[PDB]
Amino acid sequence: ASRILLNNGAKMPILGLGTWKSPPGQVTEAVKVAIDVGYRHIDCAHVYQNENEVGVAIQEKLREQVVKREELFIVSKLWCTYHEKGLVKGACQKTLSDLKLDYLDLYLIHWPAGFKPGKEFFPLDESGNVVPSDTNILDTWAAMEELVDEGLVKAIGISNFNHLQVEMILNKPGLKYKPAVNQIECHPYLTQEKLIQYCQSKGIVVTAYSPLGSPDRPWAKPEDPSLLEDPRIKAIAAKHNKTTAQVLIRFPMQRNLVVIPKSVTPERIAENFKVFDFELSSQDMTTLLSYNRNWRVCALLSCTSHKDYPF
Ligand SMILES: NC(=O)c1ccc[n+]([C@@H]2O[C@H](COP(=O)([O-])OP(=O)(O)OC[C@H]3O[C@@H](n4cnc5c(N)ncnc54)[C@H](OP(=O)(O)O)[C@@H]3O)[C@@H](O)[C@H]2O)c1
Ligand SMILES: O=C(O)COc1cc(F)ccc1C(=S)NCc1ccc(Br)cc1F
Ligand SMILES: [Br-]
């Protein structure tokens, strides 16, 4: 099954295309190719600074009638400097404008922390620490709920929220819409069994980001572990006559997760979609789970002292 049912009643494609780091001069073609080869879910964010170019691609494929808008599942995210009551709607609207859409299928709080509003995405003090906002997560959630009620988004969710933070939202006094999704880092070196079982037990769908270990993350280092080169994963791939990436994409799908591998390489975009015609065994799945090292590629020192930093 290609889509998972969310607690808002809508169906979400379990495979999407990621767009963080996709250069603005490559990402329009990447998304055009993705839609042509079958993708129906695109993962976006204002902070990635490429939503206009993503939107050019989406718009051309809608115009050309390659796909219907109701067949697409477009996700974006509220950046940390817009957590304030009076800034959430305009942030969402900017994203809609850039993506050329009149609604999003899903809008996430990108990180639990709010930052001082302004032009800078990471406002710092003179000593290098991010400057917080005093807006708490529950007030930002209420602002997200209004976007549903105004028809700008069909579902709302969270991203990078830890157990305590998800629970805080679920226990919100007067909660109107539960989060549909929690999007978190997840791959064989960071398997997230505790947080995933918690979210799944509450009917929250988990999306796995960086499923290939984000080898293009700006802060990579030569010595770091490499999923795509791990000979044990290669061996599982070889047994199935698939690539390592295909194994790494199929793995979260069989955990009832959504997965959002990024590529701007047309051959790889196509290859990465070819994951609905094989099955990893239970043994394969447990073996991949056994590679957990609690190795997190998405973390940031400048934000570690923020009250709401999740890790
Ligand atoms: N919510 C959050 O806080 C958050 C944080 C991080 C990521 N995300 C979302 O998750 C998406 C995926 O994560 P990610 O971008 O960090 O990394 P990723 O998907 O784990 O890895 C992307 C890297 O893998 C390469 N790649 C893709 N397919 C490949 C294949 N078949 N063979 C070999 N290499 C392949 C890509 O290269 P090329 O592009 O050069 O082909 C790129 O360098 C992001 O783009 C973003 O949409 C969300
Ligand atoms: O964030 C992404 O989607 C992928 O990553 C990024 C993508 C961007 F376009 C800009 C910064 C980031 C980083 S540095 N994210 C880490 C990060 C940000 C905020 C807080 Br609170 C903690 C934290 F760990
Ligand atoms: Br944070």
Nearest to 166 by CA among 207, 199, 205: 199
The β-bridge partners of 259 are 15, 208
Residue 48 CA, ligand 2 centroid: distance in Å: 9
Mutate-to-test residue for ligand 2 from 20, 27, 130, 158, highest number of ligand atoms within 8 A of CB: 20
Cβ count near 5 (within 10 Å): 12
CA dist 207 and 184 (Å) reads 6
* 151 annotated ligand binder: no
PDB resolution in Å: 1.5
Residue 117 CA, ligand 3 centroid: distance in Å: 15
Cβ count near 28 (within 10 Å): 21
Active site residues: 48
Nearest to 78 by CA among 8, 143, 167: 143
CA dist 154 and 256 (Å) reads 21
Experimental method: X-ray
Name the residue with the closest Cα to ligand 1, atom 33.
245
Pocket of ligand 1 (CB under 6 A): 18-21, 43, 110, 159-160, 183, 209-217, 228, 243, 245, 260-265, 268, 271-272, 298
Pocket of ligand 2 (CB under 6 A): 20, 45, 47-48, 80, 111, 113, 298-300, 303, 306, 309
For 147, half-sphere exposure in the C-beta direction (CA atoms, 13 angstrom radius) is 34
Q: What amino acid is encoded at 248 in this protein?
A: L
**Secondary structure of residue 112 in the 3-state scheme:** coil
* 274 annotated ligand binder: no
Q: What amino acid is encoded at 1 in this protein?
A: A
CA dist 266 and 28 (Å) reads 11
Mutate-to-test residue for ligand 1 from 54, 161, 190, 209, highest number of ligand atoms within 8 A of CB: 209
* 220 annotated ligand binder: yes
The CA–CA distances, whole Å, from 1 to 196, 277, 286 equal 20, 11, 21
Name the residue with the closest Cα to ligand 1, atom 11.
18
β-pairing, 3-5 vs 258-259, is unpaired
* 14 annotated ligand binder: yes
- What does the block give as tokens for 88? 């959430």
Residue 211 CA, ligand 1 centroid: distance in Å: 7
Consecutive H or E run containing 13? strand 11-13
SS3 string, 151-220, reads: CCECCEEEECCCHHHHHHHHCCCCCCCCCCEEEEECECCECCHHHHHHHHHCCCEEEEECCCCCCCCCCC
- What does the block give as tokens for 94? 């900017």
Nearest to 74 by CA among 50, 112, 100: 100
- What does the block give as tokens for 76? 């974006």
Write out the CATH class of domain 1-311: alpha beta
CB 182 within 8 A of CB 161: yes
Consecutive H or E run containing 294? none
- What does the block give as tokens for 9? 């009643």
Domain residue limits, the chain:
1-311
Q: What does the chain come to in residues?
A: 311
Residue 201 CA, ligand 2 centroid: distance in Å: 27
